[PDB]
Structures are given as structure tokens and as C-alpha cells.
Symmetry: C4
Subunit: 79 residues, 4 copies
């Protein structure tokens, strides 16, 4: 990545690794180490993502929002 990784990673049911970074991105990485996708938030992602029963990834960001992201990398909703 291009920023310090303060978020603690979470592992999806299929092995996908989700982690936030200081470059405003929540990352999704395959077990082989290559990028599944990346989601742009407004600020540093110090929150550690949590994975729902249906696969939704929830993580907070420094831009005041709690994000919900579908497993394909596009936004479900933000609070």
C-alpha cells in the first residue's frame, strides 16, 4: 500500500483479508496476496473492519462515517 497500516485485518469466510490504511482506503486482498479491490473513504482508516453474516464489511473512517461495503467492493450505505 501507500500508507501506514494501523487497522487490524479481518478474514472473510472465503479467505479474503480486509484491512484499512492511512491512504484513505479499505483494502481487500486474496489469500495469494493480490488486490481484490479497494474502497476510497475520505480519511485515514484506523478502525478495524468487522464482517457480517452476509459478508458485509463494516469499518469506520476519520471522515465521520461508519461504512458498510458489499463483498464486491461497492458501497452499501454510510452513516
Amino acid at each position: 500500500t501507500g500508507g501506514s497500516v494501523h487497522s487490524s485485518p479481518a478474514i472473510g469466510q472465503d479467505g479474503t483479508i480486509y484491512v484499512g490504511s492511512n491512504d484513505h482506503y479499505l483494502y481487500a486482498i486474496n489469500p495469494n496476496g493480490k488486490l481484490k479491490w479497494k474502497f476510497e473513504t475520505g480519511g485515514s482508516v484506523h478502525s478495524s473492519p468487522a464482517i457480517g453474516q452476509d459478508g458485509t464489511i463494516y469499518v469506520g473512517s476519520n471522515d465521520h462515517y461508519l461504512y458498510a461495503i458489499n463483498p464486491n467492493g461497492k458501497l452499501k450505505w454510510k452513516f
Copy 2:
């Protein structure tokens, strides 16, 4: 929300997302992205919430306290 989100989200038995924020509040969000309730502490909430077997949500705050909150949103006890 109106504060930086450092707490990492915790997901309840029914899918309720709990996360703290710098605006002194512990938020509770429904899986559809709408507020269920919010509880106010006396400082920033950087601890990440932990959920018990009976649904109690535990979380710390900068105001020296450890909070226990029932799933309704009202205080159980503080330490």
C-alpha cells in the same frame, strides 16, 4: 456521525453494528444503515465494543469508565 470513528465495529446476534466515536457517543446502527439508538459517555470512545452472550455491549471511554449497555440502549452499569 459527527466525530472521528476510531472504535472498531462489533456485530450483535441480530446484526446490529455497534461502534464508538469521538463525539462521546456509542452508536447502534441497524443493518439497513439507520440509527437504532445512541448512548452518551463523558469522553471520546476509542475502545472497541464487546458483546456478551445475553447481548450486553461493553465498551470503555476516556472518562475513566467501563460501560455496560443493554441492547435497548440504556445503561446497565458503569465501572
Copy 3:
């Protein structure tokens, strides 16, 4: 307790809530909100505690050590 609580709490099998604080103490609290015991480290405890299979409570401190503490509240070892 007394001090900013950055440690995210962990929940034991019997419902005991373990959390660290800046007062150099690791805290074990019963589900009712009363103190069970406290263990003193050499620095602030920002690490969130993790619980082993036999009940051992692992947590780190700013005094460079990782602490292993028995469920009764006494030192198992420190690294």
C-alpha cells in the same frame, strides 16, 4: 477504575469482562459490574486482552512486556 480506557474489553467463559487502562492495571470485572481482581504492570495497557483456551489472559503493556495472567489474577509469566 481510573484512567483512559483504550483497551477493548474481552469476555471470558463465565462472563468476566477483562480490560486494560492507563492506570497500569489489567482489570477483571464480574458481569454485575463489581471488581474481581486487578493486576499491576509497569506501564499503560493499550493492548486489548486475549483469552486462551484454559482461561489465560494475555495482554501487552508499555513496559515492553507481554503478560500471561491466570484467571485467578496472578502472574503466569511475562515475556
Copy 4:
């Protein structure tokens, strides 16, 4: 260890306790308190490690990389 321990410990399938430290190392410590191995990253390890189903340890570092480490303490890949 050599630096402050902010990473939260994670427990493997065989009871191994994994934790990061500000000395740029990810530690693997047996339940008996003896060192199993330590893996050097570029910068401080604030991220709390996560463990996949095959035993891979995922942790973030201040050197911008997300690390995947085999159970034997050797690098699988970095992102």
C-alpha cells in the same frame, strides 16, 4: 520485548500467542512463555494480527505493508 506492545494478541490453533511490538517485530510465543520465532517488519507493528484457517498470520506494519506470515515464521507475501 524491545518496544511498547500496542498490538492485541491473537491465539493460534496450537495455542501460540502472536503479538506485534514497537521494535518492528511480530512475536510468536508458546503458551509456556518461551519464544517460538520473531519476524522483522520495516516499522512499528501497531496492527493486531489475525489468523486464517490454514494458520497464516496477517498483520499490518507502519512500513505500509500488510504481511502474511506462514506458521513457521517465514514470509508468505507482503502487499
